[PDB]
């Protein structure tokens, strides 16, 4: 994948330019944000199960989806949906540490829309779930971390939709 540090490096490498102060400043910016991100990631990992639970409660469960004939009806489908939710959470956490959205594009985003359309999974409902997770995550991580966390969640949402 790519990370913020590597992204700067790669941009310079295509130019063939040696690293310059302006580039260094971007790197420096990342380094300050880094400590916050690490703390946020640890919070998310510990509360991951609950985050998913809360988000499902907010959007997915107690709905047509869970009712017979709904996409998340049957244990197998229910389990699949919560597995997908976990994927989104884990990748968003990875992206937040990295400081780059690229990993989301390379692993999660590419071909997901097409897969979902063939499966008949509802994309808008999934997006709703992602947004719900974001809200829950925002609380736990705290405000400074929340802004950073939110962008990756939004990136996933935009990709799927």
């Amino acid at each position: 994948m790519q990370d913020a540090i590597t992204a700067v490096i790669n941009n310079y490498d295509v130019q063939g330019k040696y690293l310059d102060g302006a580039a260094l400043d971007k790197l420096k910016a990342y380094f300050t944000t880094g400590a916050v991100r690490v703390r946020a990631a640890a919070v998310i990992s510990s509360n991951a199960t609950t985050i998913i639970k809360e988000a499902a409660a907010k959007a997915l469960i107690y709905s047509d989806l869970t009712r017979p004939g709904g996409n998340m009806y049957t244990t197998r489908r229910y389990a699949a949906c919560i597995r997908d939710m976990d994927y989104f959470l884990r990748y968003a956490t990875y992206a937040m540490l990295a400081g780059d959205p690229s990993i989301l594009d390379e692993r999660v985003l590419n071909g997901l829309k097409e897969t979902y359309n063939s499966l008949g999974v509802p994309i808008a409902a999934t997006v709703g779930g992602i947004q719900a997770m974001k809200e829950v995550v925002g609380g736990l991580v705290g405000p400074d971390a929340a802004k950073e966390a939110s962008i990756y969640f939004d990136y996933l949402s935009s990709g799927l939709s």
Partner: protein
């Protein structure tokens, strides 16, 4: 980068980042500012490092700049120096990244094959990198030099 490496291992295992892995990330972000300064120093001295290293290399290996040798002639000598410059730029990238991976992708994979087609001697290239290291070490402070040395050594090992 260090962080990229950690994330990639986690993704393969399909797990959230381990505490130990997270700790290493924390250490790296603290180190980064010092690393940036080390890189900056080498960038400023880049032109002289290349020049000095080139001269040393040519003294060490008369053959390369000889009618038989690949380096011989102005065009060829320029290209040899350009190569040295390329490797120095890669080293700076490595120091800021904290990993050899950035260096490795751009410079060390397929290097043997490329040079063999060119017919450039790989050992001479290694000597040039060693020469650059010595020049760079002198300008750097001792602890800074050790950090820089690791990346330089990797390059020498790779070729």
């Amino acid at each position: 980068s260090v962080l990229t490496k950690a994330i990639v291992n986690a993704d393969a295992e399909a797990r959230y980042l381990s505490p130990g892995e997270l700790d290493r990330i924390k250490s790296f972000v603290a180190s980064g500012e010092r690393r940036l300064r080390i890189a900056q120093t080498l960038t400023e001295a880049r032109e002289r490092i290349v020049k000095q290293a080139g001269d040393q290399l040519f003294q060490k290996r008369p053959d390369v700049v000889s009618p038989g040798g690949n380096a011989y002639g102005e065009k060829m000598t320029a290209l040899c120096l350009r190569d040295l410059d390329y490797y120095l730029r890669l080293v700076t990238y490595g120091i800021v990244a904290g990993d050899v991976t950035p260096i490795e992708e751009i410079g060390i994979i397929g290097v043997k094959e490329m040079y063999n087609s060119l017919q450039t001697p790989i050992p001479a290239v290694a000597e040039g990198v060693r020469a650059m290291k010595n020049v760079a070490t002198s300008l750097l402070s001792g602890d800074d030099a050790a950090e820089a040395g690791f990346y330089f050594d990797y390059l020498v090992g790779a070729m």
